[PDB]
Copies of this chain bind each other. A is one copy, B any other.
Amino acid sequence: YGFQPTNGVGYQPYRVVVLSFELLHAPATVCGPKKSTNLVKNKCVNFNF
């Protein structure tokens, strides 16, 4: 490449990172920043296991 500060856009260097994920293939090990609550039972509730 010929990266020079004089060159306009379309030639200035750019940094690129691509992120790829799995889709529920095993016990997931990279979760989100959520707060696990207690464990209720015998009640009509909605869960996020």
Contact = CB atoms under 8 A, between A and B. Distances in A.
Interface in A5-39: 6, 8-9
A6 B10 CA distance: 10
Interface of A: 6, 8-9
B9 A9 contact: no
Instruction: Give the interface SS of chain A, mostly helix, strand, loop or mixed.
Output: loop
A9 B5 CA distance: 9
Nearest to A6: B9
Contacts of A6: 9
A47 to B, nearest CB: 48
A23 to B, nearest CB: 37
A9 B11 CA distance: 13
